[PDB]
Ligand binder design. Structure first.
Ligand SMILES: O=c1ccn([C@@H]2O[C@H](COP(=O)(O)OP(=O)(O)O)[C@@H](O)[C@H]2O)c(=O)[nH]1
Ligand SMILES: O=c1ccn([C@@H]2O[C@H](COP(=O)(O)OP(=O)(O)O)[C@@H](O)[C@H]2O)c(=O)[nH]1
Ligand SMILES: [Mn+2]
Ligand SMILES: [Mn+2]
Lengths: 293, 293
């Protein structure tokens, strides 16, 4: 149940004025595509607070990637769902190495100890299994929504309840203006992740997805099952978990899609006009240095 | 539980191309505004057919308004939810005057015998009470979604699963391009339907709303209760059931808004360029004669 909104004073939504003229703001299956200017955060905050919404945020900090935790959590405190209940879930092989970040009221952090796979490919891919496992163990009773992100990142601006929905994917910043033929989907038919050349809506980033606990539970379970079939078949998807994520979101359409404001790399891409805000962004790293012992 | 969609070939959604540049396609609370050009019906049909969706359609034909039934029903067969399970509910004081209209496969019609009120105002307003009663009696078991419309209407083009959502209202054709101060909301603070000159998102039409049975139940019961409070306070809202629908949808935001394609009057308004399709339209009638003996 949802009680009545209180009286609010805000500008009238003009029916004959498009909210954006430079970008697509709704998918052909009527999912909103979340850009700045498409929402009034005041209305959405009211809606979500009146539900006492608790948002879980999962992040994996395995082996050397513990180094990204401090900036990730400090910026999450400044920008991620401020005013709402938040439960951080840090998956790590090194519980002692989780920095002691001071948290706002109504926000808590849990450390979930897990195994460190040797191969970086397995570290990234096994996040699906691990999320799925803890959806059972913990998240179903603890939180309403889950948001699942990469750690080598920082919040630079608002990430709030505008993203919340049963299932969401984010536009990968490298491909939002590309034709589907250029998307780096899995193209080998022997993989469970395969998408043919004439299919695909968007190229979603592996670094930012989520939804309700139930929907994230289903997504991560499915992606993990597809990975195991691939492994038994002696194939490993070209872009690992992001490939299986893309396959899943093609056949199970997300109920919102996040613009690349939510997933960016300023060093490689600048700050284009179509991006009114840069919300969540890559922290520079040396792949070979950081991903191996 | 949702099964995967099958393989489908369709044009790629273009992120840097707006689907409409002339109209607002999403509300500030991230509810789609349904216009032609915003949806791919093939994907939506797939989505809803896979869930085995049943749509109820309520229509009141009390006293002389039985005359409208034939054209309403014949055109519904041509244009309303074709391919999906439909259940028409005809509320009438004259069961024998319901025309024997031939129905497509998977479609059925039930006659709901109710009282006739003397005043047109009460016939219109009392639909809220009657819908609400039958939401308990029949609808919750029988259908997934309810579509609640005026009978003095004909379908002229597609009205399909693009409208379906937990709660929707429709932009009144007379007001979509108006400033909120010109909306004919109830303006007397003495009425439960009162909305101040500085509030209001849209002027929703009383002739087309719906949603899940759960949400329609809530809306209709709330609107009836508000009418009864007003009755005890010796006030009748200016636009009757429509006034109360408008107060309700201000405080409980619909999860889709239908554009005026879905509620039009060509005689009064012509055929403007922002209307790519005229889907559901008023049949000419004389007020003086049809609303009274
Ligand atoms: O040694 C590793 C490798 C990966 N990861 C996690 O898996 C994510 C995905 O890896 P990465 O960010 O390297 O993928 P990229 O953004 O570079 O494509 C990282 O953000 C971490 O959350 C980790 O914790 N330790
Ligand atoms: O004598 C009446 C008066 C009203 N209605 C029903 O109530 C709706 C609202 O009335 P009407 O269409 O006249 O309202 P208008 O479109 O003129 O505002 C109609 O479409 C009918 O379904 C009816 O059945 N018989
Ligand atoms: Mn990363
Ligand atoms: Mn009418």
């Amino acid at each position: 149940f949802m009680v009545s909104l209180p009286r609010m004073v805000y500008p009238q939504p003009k029916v004959l004025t498009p909210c954006r003229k430079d970008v697509l703001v709704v998918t052909p299956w009527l999912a909103p595509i979340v850009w700045e200017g498409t929402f009034n955060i005041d209305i959405l905050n009211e809606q979500f607070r009146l539900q006492n919404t608790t948002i879980g945020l999962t992040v994996f900090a395995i082996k050397k990637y513990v180094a990204f935790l401090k900036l990730f959590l400090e910026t999450a405190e400044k920008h991620f769902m401020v005013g709402h209940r938040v439960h951080y879930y840090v998956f790590t092989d090194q519980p002692a190495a989780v920095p002691r970040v001071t948290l706002g009221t109504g926000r808590q952090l849990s450390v979930l100890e897990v195994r460190a796979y040797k191969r970086w490919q397995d570290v990234s891919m096994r996040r699906m299994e691990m999320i799925s496992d803890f959806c059972e163990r913990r998240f179903l009773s603890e939180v309403d929504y889950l948001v699942c992100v990469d750690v080598d990142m920082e919040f630079r601006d608002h990430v709030g309840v505008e993203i919340l929905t049963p299932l969401f994917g984010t536009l990968h910043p490298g491909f939002y203006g590309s034709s589907r033929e250029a998307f780096t989907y899995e193209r080998r038919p022997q993989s469970q992740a395969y998408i043919p050349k004439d299919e695909g809506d968007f190229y979603y980033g592996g670094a930012f997805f989520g939804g309700s606990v139930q929907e994230v539970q289903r997504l991560t379970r499915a992606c993990h099952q597809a990975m195991m079939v691939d492994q038994a078949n002696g194939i490993e998807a070209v872009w690992h978990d992001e490939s299986h994520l893309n396959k899943y979101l093609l056949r199970h359409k997300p109920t919102k899609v996040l613009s690349p404001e939510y997933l960016w790399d300023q060093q490689l891409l600048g700050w284009p006009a179509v991006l009114r805000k840069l919300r969540f962004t890559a922290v520079p790293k040396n792949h070979q240095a950081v991903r191996n012992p």
